[PDB]
Assembly symmetry: C2
Homo-oligomer: 534 residues x 2
């Protein structure tokens, strides 16, 4: 029943990749900025409407030619769709798979806004296709990758990307798919959301999510796109996959009748948490980190603690044994991508055995009584100490109109470099991106296995024959700086040299015949960053 | 693993209820009209190589709601997407049609809504002093869970045209694994803003005559339709043991995606055949035993032949017999209800099973000449007629819904083989209730079933009128006297041993009517929601 997380990718505020996301989390970086001019001018509305957001870079950019999509079609495609496509491609690559090697594969996308529909409608020049639905966000992935499993967009507002994961997990567990991509996307492209949520008081007056901190009076909207590739644990183990973390349980529910549709319910939150702990078969005493929903609201924050404390109580009376935090303190409330950002953070912490700082709570919310609870707020990045049993994390996401989700994760306890891209420019970018990732911790055999068997063999090719990582780094740099005659590099459009020669010429090599090293994260395809808009 | 359909409700073009829907289906009524002026003026776009469509299937009173019933303010009702308003009333109806209240039905009851458009967001954004624009789907499902106090999964899903079948599929799976004990599933679609028409017109999706000519000659696109609907689903064994009224049984559902096809909006016969085979295998039945299929059936020149090719391929493993299975589509009647297309099709298929009647499929008197029905399992249903006993085995129907961007669904369904305490929120609604109830009475109604259902399957609301009645004729006379404004009537107690029970109830006590007993549940008219207009 357990599900392995075998691949992850995404883009978040100040993070072009999960790797940059992780560095920013460890550093405690506040990633919120003012609304960029290229989206709208916040000064237009200063008479207050929030001027802050977590924004991703290059939200309007895409590489349609990679996918054989025309420029015209790219312009009409919702950026959310464009970015989720790239992200899913990257997630599969992070896992060390190609669509071929990975067809009952599901795609489950959380999404709650369609800003590009508003933008398209304003522009309705002669008629053109406005992006009016969600489904293509998921369906485009299934289409391009030739996947036949369920392909669904779901909206539960703030919990949407956990709902998406829950549905992917259940689909895998009943055998409807063998693996699935699950995640979410959220882009802030048009000011209507800021005006509208401002009119209801949802946005904080300082532009921060002060997770369990003093003075919190709302949230700050954030952008994000992210996915995880999920597979049954046992299969992932047999296939020699790299497993970031194991999902032991997920549960969803609704608040039912409470005083107002947007009032969160401690009882219903405790309910979903207990249901998930029971599905996972674990005691709450064994959970040593929780990734809270954590939006920084004066009503919300105390309720979230009350719901967690009630759930944990049927099960222990020990106090302050579990750390808590939220990624919202770093990047804001990514809305439909809130669950996927939180799950990505949780899985990284587990994989890296590191708990990161939760921001904006140096002064705690004075009403929360953490001393009388299971929890303390993580105030510095530090090693995650061996619990004493495995490191286990809970993860919560609570939709504004009542749909709740909780997931429990557990830590997982266990040459020829053929690079290719669509063209020469993308290949040089690939080589530079690969070179920069290399350090004394890179494992050559795993790097090579993953590039050989977990990347598509594309049009423009550069194969390197290398002794070790230092030799690889030197060759990539020589290639990048345009050096002409590089020994041990073959270029084009079981003897190593011959294999190389043949691959550079365009032949298919069955690299598997040579063997398995374990799969390992390698930088993913360097999509061109070209702008497309209506 | 079989799932009972125990309650259904909905509104569709020319149909204020499922019962009007059924009558229109039997009659072969073409429900398509020109765009009503109250939505937009189609003449605005008549000169914008296909012209912007001036046709749709439109429901009446799309902009109406009874917010006071739900204790929603007028201001909140204006800001609420009409899709959310109507789905709320429709789920209320569905539960009432099943003979339940939220209390007697329920915690773990799921709500799963298919949705693919948010025209009210466009309308809201045009009008943007700040106010809340309806920018998400989730409240469509979540408001139902909220109001009814349900704690199960509450999800909106979008797989475009297949959305409501995807919704049903998810509800079934949820019930089968024990996450919900019952679930509402359905969909909603409203055509409130012209962007979709301009947009879908630009790509040629809309037909030039404003019809879905399901398997008929000359079909060149579809006509957009409005609809809202839901079904209440429950495990068959539990529905039997609770004495529910079962319209039909769902034996299997399956969903998939087309994967890589020549263009994202091109349908795939292989993938359609695979979803149909997967569903038949889940249901455990041979395709030779399917005697009706509710086709996706949009009337497009590419779509229609592909659908027949997919169905033929799936049925062929199973059999070589020809023309043993009738086929048709509700889209020929009401248009392509988009996110609500699956729920309208499922509702038609369940009705046909329950009533043992196959209805006419429109606009195919001339068949699409490329189809070759003679070499296939199928013939198009051209008249409404009795559904003949298949031979002995049950009447079984397949039901298909194929999303424009590739998400497919198929479902297989099988046939399933005194004191009147009326109440409403206020006096005006109670008079309307009595009039609606009176009109539904005929020599076919059975008093003991009617009384059981009003007693145990309706909430005891604020304004009350209890009648003590000897038979249906006595009931009808009393309701008519009440409606014409008589305040005092023998055997009527009003307020805010039969006689004492009545007295007590009229005074405001709650009475446990079950103690008196079970008659089978039946459909009785549902709450007469006020039709008041709310807009931004």
């Amino acid at each position: 029943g357990d599900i392995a997380i075998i691949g992850m990718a995404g883009r978040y505020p100040k993070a072009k990749s999960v790797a940059e996301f992780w560095e920013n989390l460890k550093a405690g970086t506040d990633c919120i900025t003012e609304v960029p001019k290229s989206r709208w001018d916040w000064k237009t509305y200063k008479n207050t409407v929030s001027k802050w957001g977590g924004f991703i870079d290059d939200a309007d950019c895409f590489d349609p030619q990679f996918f054989r999509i025309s420029p015209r079609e790219a312009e009409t495609m919702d950026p959310q769709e464009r970015l989720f496509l790239e992200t899913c491609w990257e997630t599969i690559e992070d896992a060390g798979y190609t669509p071929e090697t990975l067809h009952p594969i599901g795609v489950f996308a959380g999404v709650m806004h369609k800003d590009y529909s508003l933008i398209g409608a304003e522009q309705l020049t002669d008629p053109f296709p406005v992006s009016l639905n969600y489904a293509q966000i998921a369906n485009r992935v299934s289409y391009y990758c030739d996947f036949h499993g369920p392909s669904i967009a779901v909206d539960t507002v703030c919990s949407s990307s956990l709902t998406a994961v829950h549905l992917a997990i259940e689909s895998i567990r009943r055998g409807e798919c063998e693996a699935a991509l699950a995640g979410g996307v959220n882009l802030s492209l048009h000011p209507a959301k800021y005006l509208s949520y401002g009119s209801v008081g949802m946005h904080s007056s300082d532009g921060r999510c002060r997770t369990f901190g003093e003075g919190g009076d709302g949230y700050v909207s954030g952008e994000g796109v992210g996915a995880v590739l999920l597979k049954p644990l046992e299969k992932a183990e047999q296939d020699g996959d790299r497993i970031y973390a194991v999902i032991k349980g997920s549960a969803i529910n609704h608040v039912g009748k409470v005083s107002g549709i947007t009032v969160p319910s401690p009882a219903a939150q405790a309910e979903v948490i207990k249901a998930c702990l029971k599905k996972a078969g674990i005691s709450p005493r064994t959970v040593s980190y929780v990734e809270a929903h954590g939006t920084g609201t004066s009503l919300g924050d105390p309720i979230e603690i009350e719901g967690l404390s009630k759930a944990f109580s049927q099960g222990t009376q020990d106090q302050q044994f579990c750390s808590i935090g939220s990624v919202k303190s770093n990047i804001g409330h990514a809305e439909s991508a809130a669950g996927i950002s939180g799950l990505t953070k949780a899985a990284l912490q587990l994989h890296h055995k590191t708990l990161v700082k939760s921001l904006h709570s140096a002064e705690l919310n004075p009403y929360l009584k953490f001393e009388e609870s299971p929890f303390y707020v993580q105030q510095q990045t530090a090693p995650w100490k061996q619990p004493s049993y495995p490191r286990r994390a809970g993860l919560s996401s609570f939709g504004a109109s009542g749909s709740n989700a909780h997931i429990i994760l557990e830590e997982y306890i266990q040459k020829l470099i053929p690079l290719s891209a669509r063209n020469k420019d993308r290949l040089l970018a690939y080589a530079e991106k690969l070179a920069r990732s290399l350090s004394e911790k890179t494992v050559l055999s795993e790097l090579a296995y993953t590039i050989q068997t977990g990347r598509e063999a594309m049009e423009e090719r550069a194969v390197f024959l290398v002794n070790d990582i230092r030799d690889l780094k030197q060759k990539l740099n020589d290639f990048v700086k345009g050096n002409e005659n590089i020994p041990g590099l073959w270029r084009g459009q079981d003897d190593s040299i011959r294999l190389a020669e043949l691959w550079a010429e365009g032949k298919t090599v069955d690299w598997n015949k040579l063997y398995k090293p374990r799969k390992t994260s390698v930088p993913t395809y360097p999509f061109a960053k070209e702008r497309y808009w209506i």
